[PDB]
Write a protein that binds this ligand. Sequence first.
Ligand SMILES: Nc1ncnc2c1ncn2[C@@H]1O[C@H](COP(=O)(O)OP(=O)(O)OP(=O)(O)O)[C@@H](O)[C@H]1O
Ligand SMILES: Nc1ncnc2c1ncn2[C@@H]1O[C@H](COP(=O)(O)OP(=O)(O)OP(=O)(O)O)[C@@H](O)[C@H]1O
Ligand SMILES: [Mg+2]
Ligand SMILES: [Mg+2]
Lengths: 259, 291, 638, 630
Amino acid sequence: VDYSVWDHIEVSDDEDETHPNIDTASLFRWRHQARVERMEQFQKEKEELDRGCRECKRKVAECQRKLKELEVAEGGKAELERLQAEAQQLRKEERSWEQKLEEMRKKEKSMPWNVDTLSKDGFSKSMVNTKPEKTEEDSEEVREQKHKTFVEKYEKQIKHFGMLRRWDDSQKYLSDNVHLVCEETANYLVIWCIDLEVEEKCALMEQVAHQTIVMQFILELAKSLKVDPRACFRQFFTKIKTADRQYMEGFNDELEAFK
Amino acid sequence: RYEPVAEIGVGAYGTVYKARDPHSGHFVALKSVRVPNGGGGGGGLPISTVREVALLRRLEAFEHPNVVRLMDVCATSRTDREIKVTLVFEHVDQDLRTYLDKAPPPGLPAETIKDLMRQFLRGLDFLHANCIVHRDLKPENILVTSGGTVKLADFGLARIYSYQMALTPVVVTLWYRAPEVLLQSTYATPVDMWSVGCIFAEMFRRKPLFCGNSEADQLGKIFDLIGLPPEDDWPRDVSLPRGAFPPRGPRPVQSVVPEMEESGAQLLLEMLTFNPHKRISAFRALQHSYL
Amino acid sequence: EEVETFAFQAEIAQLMSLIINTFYSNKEIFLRELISNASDALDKIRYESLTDPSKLDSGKELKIDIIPNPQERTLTLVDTGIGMTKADLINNLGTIAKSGTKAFMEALQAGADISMIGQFGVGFYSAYLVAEKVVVITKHNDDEQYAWESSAGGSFTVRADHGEPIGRGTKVILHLKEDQTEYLEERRVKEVVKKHSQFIGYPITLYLEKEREKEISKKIKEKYIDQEELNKTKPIWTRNPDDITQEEYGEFYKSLTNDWEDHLAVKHFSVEGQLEFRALLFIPRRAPFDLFENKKKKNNIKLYVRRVFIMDSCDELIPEYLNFIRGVVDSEDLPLNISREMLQQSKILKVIRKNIVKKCLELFSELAEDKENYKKFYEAFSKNLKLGIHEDSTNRRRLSELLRYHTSQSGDEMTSLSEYVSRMKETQKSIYYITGESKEQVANSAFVERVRKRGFEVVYMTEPIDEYCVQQLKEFDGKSLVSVTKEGLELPEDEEEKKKMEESKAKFENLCKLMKEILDKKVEKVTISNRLVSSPCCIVTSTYGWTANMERIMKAQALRDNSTMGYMMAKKHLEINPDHPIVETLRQKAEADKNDKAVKDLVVLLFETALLSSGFSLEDPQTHSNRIYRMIKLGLGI
Amino acid sequence: EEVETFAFQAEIAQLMSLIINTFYSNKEIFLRELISNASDALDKIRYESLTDPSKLDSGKELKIDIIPNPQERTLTLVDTGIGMTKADLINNLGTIAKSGTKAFMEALQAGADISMIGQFGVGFYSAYLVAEKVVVITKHNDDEQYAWESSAGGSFTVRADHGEPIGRGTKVILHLKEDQTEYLEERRVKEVVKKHSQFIGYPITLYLEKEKEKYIDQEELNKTKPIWTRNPDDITQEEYGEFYKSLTNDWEDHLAVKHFSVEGQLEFRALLFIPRRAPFDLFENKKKKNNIKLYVRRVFIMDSCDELIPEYLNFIRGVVDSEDLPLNISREMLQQSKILKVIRKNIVKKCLELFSELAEDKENYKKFYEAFSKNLKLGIHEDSTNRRRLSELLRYHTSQSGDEMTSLSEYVSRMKETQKSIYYITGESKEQVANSAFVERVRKRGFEVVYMTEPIDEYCVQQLKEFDGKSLVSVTKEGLELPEDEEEKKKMEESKAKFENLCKLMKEILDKKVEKVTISNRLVSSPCCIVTSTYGWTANMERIMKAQALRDNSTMGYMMAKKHLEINPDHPIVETLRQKAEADKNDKAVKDLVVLLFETALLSSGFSLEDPQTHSNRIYRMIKLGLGID
Ligand SMILES: Nc1ncnc2c1ncn2[C@@H]1O[C@H](COP(=O)(O)OP(=O)(O)OP(=O)(O)O)[C@@H](O)[C@H]1O
Ligand SMILES: Nc1ncnc2c1ncn2[C@@H]1O[C@H](COP(=O)(O)OP(=O)(O)OP(=O)(O)O)[C@@H](O)[C@H]1O
Ligand SMILES: [Mg+2]
Ligand SMILES: [Mg+2]
């Protein structure tokens, strides 16, 4: 119901406030400078006004002490009157310094919002994901648990991959289902082809066999490159879609052998 | 996700495929347009094409039995590219000084200068609107692009020359600095324009308008064109011995500066006028029929 | 149980603050909405006076005047429109979601040509975005002068005639906020109204303190500015296209955009369908320096609703490659949202775009008849054409017919592909072309030597965008396009000469084998081709991969170092000219001694020069030059 | 008297139609608004139970249940909140611009860790964007169960409900319009859920008629939890990794993560993530820039990275969750976009810090750099204010290095005590520049050069004018300065005179092919070489720029740098030519050789060859001469 608090935000690098005849590469730097200089001038003025206020404050405070002393003094009341006037002048001066400080407060209220006034570094915590400790797991033991539950968990998804035909469908499919880029998937696809043969679904068998070798292809050069298949499976589709037909056929033969 | 089983003849829509819907079996004219998505303002839809495939997708909801749409809101293949597209642009280093070095002998096309002048002054109006202070702006801080575009940069010593620079940025002949600079006062609209006023004359001549030694000597050259009075037309903020500058007449800027059309001679003379309050503002000069 | 019936309620106190605070982000709509309301009142008069002229007895002149008052920090809007009655100030003006324009929507059955702008009944309250307080002094002809007054504090008042002559329309007093003084500036006012009240039927003037020479007349200038100029540009598309001539239309163009030269090509677009709108298309005589600078927001085709600038979404209104056509789209049937800053149901723009594009194509086709200005057009925007052909697959049938090229038979005359096709030989069943770095390169290429000998016309292509376009344009007028730079350039020729080539292949069979061994891992296959005449050999691109030019282009232009693609795309072969004296000699030299390293080195030299002649960069040019320097030293006796 | 006072009015009949037609653009947001309200009520319960746990007796579970009903074409939403009394139904629910959330927030002024939204008091009516009629059935802990029924037709009705009891909270029945049946689709529902409710603190469930076709409780609908809301010091790497992988859907976890929060007038918490590998779409102009998403109170507002972050930083994934922003009445849009610019600046600063710390981790930095050095270089090109910082991250291969990149500051640390400039060479490949004649003398003088082998380097080095007080110089341009021993200088001046007339002759031969012919000790193994004037494009820049499809060739009138023929006076060829000039300056064969040498130099120097055919033809001629053909 009231967002007027953010109607005065100053952004020195505001790329939406430019000009055709001006090089903003240096303009923004100028803006930064101006903002800084303005803050410096502001701060200086405020401090000097505060100083002056405190000076007059102390002066009148001491004069007031002296007023008490002059009042007590036997005939010092003549001087008292004089000093009272002077003390009032000092008070009035103090006041005017404070009035100026009130104007500085008004200036602060009118002050534009920026990265130095809107907020502070409330919290910061970095972390570089170095590690997770050079190690190694027995992939046979991993498969003992994974192949049994992963394949069933994603059986339908593995089959969906086997039901694809276009290269981008396969690429984007695995882009979404990156965890399927593995041997367990390829192994299922081989098994599935066998089951399809038994079920007299040879048309599907061939389509799945095609997708079988696609996953095997990914695994083939992932191993050659010594990298995780999931980190480079897109490069297989990049290779397939760009390879000269003669070499593509050669890769498919090497692939068939790899399967 | 759709499966091309045949192709539809090539027409306005290029290659169109007869693709099967794996769910219903319906065949739809699988079409596609290659897409971008912006945009130096940041990625974010081309919306003209993603929207196109989306309109055509919307037509499916009508089942409108005469709206052979592009098959699907998707903007995928449909074998074409990729070969991803991205652009990079070169920065222009064509310094005004370089321009002048490339420029022809005294009599530089006034019309070209008029355009560059009004570009400069337009830029100034922006800079004045943003209260940009830069009395230190000199010829070399002005960029003249390959398209003849004036771009201003380097707004005062406070934010320039952060790397190796001149040892005599001031000592050097300040024929391009306003009297107000030479008088050690400050920056103003008239200061800025005085600077470039001489630059504009330099452009016409392909050669600095004035050339003195000290600030007083620089004025001693300036005065030869604009005229000179005693200590009665000098500003308050004067570090130079005002009144010790023997009075003299002006020299018709029109005749002094090559191809300086009288209207521009007037504008220049106004910009060159010693007294900053007798000068013309960037806006006024910009809007003058000369330009 | 018992069903209790309730009317919906509203917390007006909260609602009002939401109207002002949450409905708008751009305070420039302040003047837009105020002006719009004034123009509605003026429309009300037009109708009433149309059917009853005596309605103008208290004033005939219809206009909107704006007078700033910096000494008060206030603005005055002068609405010479029909105004409001006391009841209207209370009922319409003083009610949220209430508008008397609706009454005219219903009342004006006869006034079918009276189009009010907007109808929500809330825009008035946006005045308080920048104003602390608003007073509306008005006198509808059916009532007296009253002064509606409110600071939007949950209540409003209405006062009796104060004597400030308002016999028609209304005086809107805008008390600006302390921090809204920028709207007292001439520049700022102009910036806003130029973007919103461009096509207001009634003239808008400003009364500004005129910058003037000191009043010492000795000299003196005029005291005030009458800025009628704001509405000097009138609606053009609203008139009958047949009655619109260039004497005014070209003036519109130079007014449309700051271009002191008439347009190149234009097209009026009139739509009478559900999405009724009219639009003007403008093609510049020269492309802008920012034509391919997609870093900047598009603003060529702008969208107006009821002649009011609403959107400039060229991004949705036109295709990227058409981002050079400038124009106006004006519809009165669009479902803008409550802020009016965005059109609801983007499917509208989807349809609109398609229909506009169709007219762009028609314009281009019209231009094609005017060969002089077509060539000017074409050259100014040939890249855009090519970008369209490449990316905009929905209009390739039309865009590809706009293509114009320099060929081996047309020479310096740039000609149409349709002209090329109509002039093809009975054996010329495919379009022959060549891409490269420059015309004189491809015109002196070994690739086009035999092609010319066979009487075939070669389309010369030199831009990288040409190299890109040939990856999309496969056939034209039913005939395929064949690059002479690729292997398998089946030129039509005498079968007996083919037999002679087969005899030559046997003759140089061992030579080809030797050369392949010499150039092992340098060339994929060494063979023979009669496409070559003056050269002994030539590196050719394969039927797949990148061409030498394409490699050059993509490898240097693309910012993505896709070595996978580059790898697969880097294919090439070596062709031999069996009739060339060197080739003949090489055979003899191979037969004399296939192990003669000097001959083998010669083959390598020729290979490297074959790469150079075919545009293939050498893997180590310095060693090439070193061989040259060695050969030079031998010639010099060094 | 002379003035009458009136309260402001509001025509609800019209206002309502504006609410459900003009106030919103997108309609699928009806789920967001209803769910948001549900979670507000669930927070209401929580708060109230903090003071009196027996308020949980009417159900101790806080969640949102989504139950589609295609048989009716309706959608049942069960909100297990406190509920509304009849008074609340007729006061708050059936009132425009009014919400009890505010009153509850007033109760929360006594001290609470409760965070709700609902300052507009209208979101309920967004249900009618999609639904024809909406029925709200509720049972407040302190009142009877009531049925609130309305089609937003200017009125609504309330009656005590019968049959199925509600322990607490409220149920919303969306009588979906006939053309709004797409919201009965699982996919469509989930789409919206992932769009705006992915970080709802309370469990949201989706019931689907599945195996036996019974409503299956999809509890995982919004299982994704907020991480930046948690204390970063208590968040492990495993948790940051799993968040990242959930955030990005990338099987591979992140390279680095950084929490960042600001406090004050601007206040938010955030997580920034650096990916271990660049996406295949990194340089894709069709990629949507939405790597870091923007939330308010964990409510998706927008993914406006376009403004939020720099283009050269368009790879960092993350979430920024603000506490209080000036959202429009349409929460999809934020007022005062300058706020996003402020946020950007703060993010950039923290990204740069993260990059610096990543650089400290040399090994992972190398990995990072290899993947995103291009972006770094783009930052150098684009960002004129953080360029200095970005240059600290630059790494190049240099003469004294192997295949290991080195910083410009490391280059500086290996500069000679008389070296005031950084020598470098750009090109297509490391081998190409390694074999350049321009770096041979440089090596002979004991200097290291920086090898620059990317096309972007022409744009990057354009901005790399000075590094740590050291200038930069290309060995390929004219004016290459290497240590000049006064003795050698005299000898070079003698050589200049020696080959003076020779150079003049060469210029006469190639008057229009070369701008200036002169000797230069920059050459070692080559007799000659073509250099680029300090003004204009280099051979490399020229070649690269001429590969641009959309370039403007007319601008080359300002970029065609002068070519000059350097001569290496120490070669037998050059000496021979001098002697040949003395023998006969008009000797054609000599002149032909000069031409051949130039083109040989021009080509091998990386400059465009005017006519490869003719050039090779001259070669063929020479070959024929060697073969004795003719
Ligand atoms: N200058 C004016 N002269 C006459 N009537 C006005 C004026 N300004 C406001 N009104 C009153 O306000 C009504 C509607 O104004 P308002 O702008 O709030 O709604 P609208 O213009 O119909 O559409 P929108 O609400 O989108 O502007 C008009 O019918 C009229 O009664
Ligand atoms: N699950 C719920 N339990 C109890 N009350 C609810 C529930 N959902 C909504 N309400 C009531 O609905 C009323 C109408 O508020 P509504 O949600 O429309 O405004 P809001 O959404 O809070 O504000 P905004 O429009 O900013 O979201 C509120 O007063 C609230 O008490
Ligand atoms: Mg209005
Ligand atoms: Mg709510």
